[PDB]
Amino acid sequence: GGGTIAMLNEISSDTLEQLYSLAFNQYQSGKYEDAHKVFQALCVLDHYDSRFFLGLGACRQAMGQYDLAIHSYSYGAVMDIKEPRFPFHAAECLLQKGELAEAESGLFLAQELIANKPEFKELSTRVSSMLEAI
Template identity: 30%
Template sequence: GPEVSSEQLEKLLSGEASFQNFFNLSDDVLLAWANQGYFFYQQGKYDDAETIFKGLVTLNPKIAYYHTALGSIYEAKQDYEEALIEFNKALEIDADDICALVNRGEIRLRKGEVLEAASDFQKGIKLDEVNIQKQRQAGEKINPDPAAQRARALSVVTYEVLKEIEKKVKETQGNG
């Protein structure tokens, strides 16, 4: 059968090479799998989508999109802790991943971490505004990120919540 050289194994275990390199799979093959996974996700077949994206994350853990997709699947399954882990991994790889930022913000908001959520939303909106500016300069069709659009709506909510908290804190301090 096929042999595994110690050099190949070392590269794989050290994280220098991915399983994708190891099995000599092209980016096109992984993209086709990702598209299939996304299709399952859109159909609400979360278990099938999860299986595919878990595989993709294993094959190449350095691609932020795979972690973001997996996080979105966990979020849809209401497994918020796992979702948070994946969004954090995605953002370690690509700090400008708008979808990961906004989704993480939504989970933080759920957990009552309002300031952290607001920060994620603001960052997502800022990144989107930079992209829109680039589109405008290039004379392209303006195409706001759907996640950033959600963040715009949610940041209004978080702002209101923060103002309420601030008011309560001031009232409490006033009673001392």
């Protein structure tokens, strides 16, 4: 039995969570480059945790690296097909690129993935507004 690199190497998910807290805080402080390097490491250690690909993609987007962010969100979307944040942040990147039709498609996808789920109240609103602007 082996699924992730961290599991194979007996790195506990508690070590990963401490590294995620560090990366998350670096991101919130505006240290996008430093956070991106911890998120690279976390993505290699556990390539099934959506938060690590959301974070890598958020650092890239913050640095204006829209295509690289979309790559992280494209992997996340195939790895976790019900997670609306992937198509949602991809659409944010596509808007910065001026690709309104593509952005709209992803926003409709995010909407279908959040329907009737109580956890996504705030995001539901964010998505409505954005489509309307478009």
